[PDB]
């Protein structure tokens with residue numbers, strides 16, 4: 275037993291990480307087949323970041339200005355193009371470590387693993403949720419851009435995130451691997467509003483199911499509720515409205531535990547209205563919302579890759 | 580910025596994970612050079628676990644009874660021996676993916692990454708501390724035994740933990756890679772006392788330094804204290820006594836932030852005596868103790884491997 279914030283094994287992604295330098299700027303790129311993907315602001319100087327004209331900046335760059343290094347071996351760049359906010363550098367060698375992979379644009383409320391990298395070298399791995407306001411709460415320093423977020427299903431790596439920037443509130447914003455930002459953010463150094471950080475209700479409920487499965491049950495009570503009644507409480511506390519689709523997704527955990535989803539909702543309602551009175555749930559003193567129902571089932575049944 | 584519980588990249592350890600079966604029992608082993616390390620209770624039946632005579636059980640086992648599989652390729656076992664609570668299976672092929680590596684017996688209060696595996700296949704990676712009572716708080720199911728804990732320093736993997744069992748309180752116990760349990764635990768299915776779960780004081784202080792660095796500073800106050808004064812509070816709250824060695828280890832973070840260690844101790848004292856009044860620190864509502872001073876410096880400066 276036990277329940278931990280758990281990232282996927284990162285070995286398949288480690289083999290794809292490279293360093294990309296353009297002028298004085300170094301960041302990370304992702305090497306799959308004969309293409310290296312990286313953030314387009316690698317072409318920017320520190321003067322450019324306020325209001326970059328990426329098309330005008332890029333026309334001054336040729337293939338040989340993109341220095342791409344895999345470990346200690348240099349890659350030969352034979353083509354470059356811009357797709358939304360990413361650059362695609364064509365190299366003359368297919369990455370021999372390329373895993374089976376897909377690009378996916380994930381939905382808010384879903385989770386993924388981040389492999390934080392610097393200078394093309396992995397530093398660490400942790401789990402993130404794509405929050406409802408399309409930010410993530412990561413650990414990113416200068417030089418981490420181009421680090422990626424992914425999921426693994428058996429042997430296929432689903433890449434869903436590339437890191438581009440930090441917002442004023444200390445949260446993080448980035449793109450899918452087609453270069454389209456999650457949320458309204460743009461790749462320029464201006465103050466950008468994130469918007470209300472709504473809690474991922476279905477995920478809190480999954481985590482409560484995780485707790486019962488792993489022996490923490492002090493929060494179960496004698497009450498029930500309705501979706502509409504519960505949602506009147508979700509509103510006051512900036513929780514996402516709970517829908518029947520969410521109830522359906524929780525079905526497996528409801529059936530595993532014998533606790534109806536609405537009964538669990540009534541537990542959540544009381545926790546939101548009364549706090550935790552100084553107690554903990556799975557070692558936390560707040561309501562955790564970055565485990566999906568799949569994550570709970572995954573971890574509580576030992577799915578491997 | 581940002582501060583997250585971060586595991587090492589797991590690729591170098593993924594390449595060492597194998598499946599070991601002996602009779603009806605399957606678990607994980609660690610393949611380095613021409614030796615596979617695994618928990619000795621792989622030789623046990625479910626009848627044996629109450630009071631196993633490991634020497635008597637093992638004499639009924641020959642090399643060909645240890646089925647060792649790396650991915651889908653079978654390894655040939657040419658020797659076996661027991662060292663404390665682990666078995667060493669000599670195979671006829673050196674693991675071609677063997678990293679530079681060391682075995683180390685880590686000190687209580689230090690952290691390490693766990694690669695949770697089932698059937699020789701990695702499932703996920705997370706960070707743990709070796710707690711003062713020599714338990715860890717992990718996520719381990721049936722079949723996870725032989726999963727390992729490690730640290731990475733540049734290119735060298737320091738293996739410090741092998742998983743063997745779960746205690747009644749839901750925490751986890753295991754050995755170094757020489758097979759010697761951390762703490763007083765033994766590999767038998769009996770109720771075993773863990774002992775008081777003391778908080779790792781130097782680590783909480785490091786995490787408070789992490790918070791200040793990453794912008795959370797509401798807990799700083801106008802007070803200071805002394806080691807002896809502070810420790811009178813550490814005692815009542817089951818914190819480890821703070822020593823000058825600990826102060827010295829915090830020196831770099833003290834110098835980086837300009838906050839004296841004793842001043843931070845006075846912040847901690849007030850938090851222990853007054854709680855957090857419903858506020859959070861680095862997204863947590865309790866005092867986190869599973870970041871070492873090195874972990875904070877590591878993550879706040881981008882060390883790679």
Ligand SMILES: *[C@H](O)[C@H](C[C@@H]1CCNC1=O)NC(=O)[C@H](CC(C)C)NC(=O)OCc1ccccc1
Pocket residue numbers: 301315318323414415416417418419420437438439440441446460461462463580
């Ligand atoms: C790419 O490596 C970098 C990631 C930042 C560095 C600090 N935390 C991060 O997530 N991205 C940028 O430097 C980005 C570039 C623009 C052209 C989009 N600007 C940015 O993040 O500005 C905010 C910021 C910069 C430096 C420190 C703290 C915040």
Ligand SMILES: *[C@H](O)[C@H](C[C@@H]1CCNC1=O)NC(=O)[C@H](CC(C)C)NC(=O)OCc1ccccc1
Pocket residue numbers: 275606620623628719720721722723724725742743744745746751765766767768
């Ligand atoms: C090895 O795979 C296994 C790890 C357990 C399974 C549940 N959580 C864990 O950490 N170890 C054992 O089965 C161990 C064997 C003895 C000979 C030491 N016994 C054990 O952990 O007993 C307690 C327990 C077993 C099963 C479920 C929950 C607790």
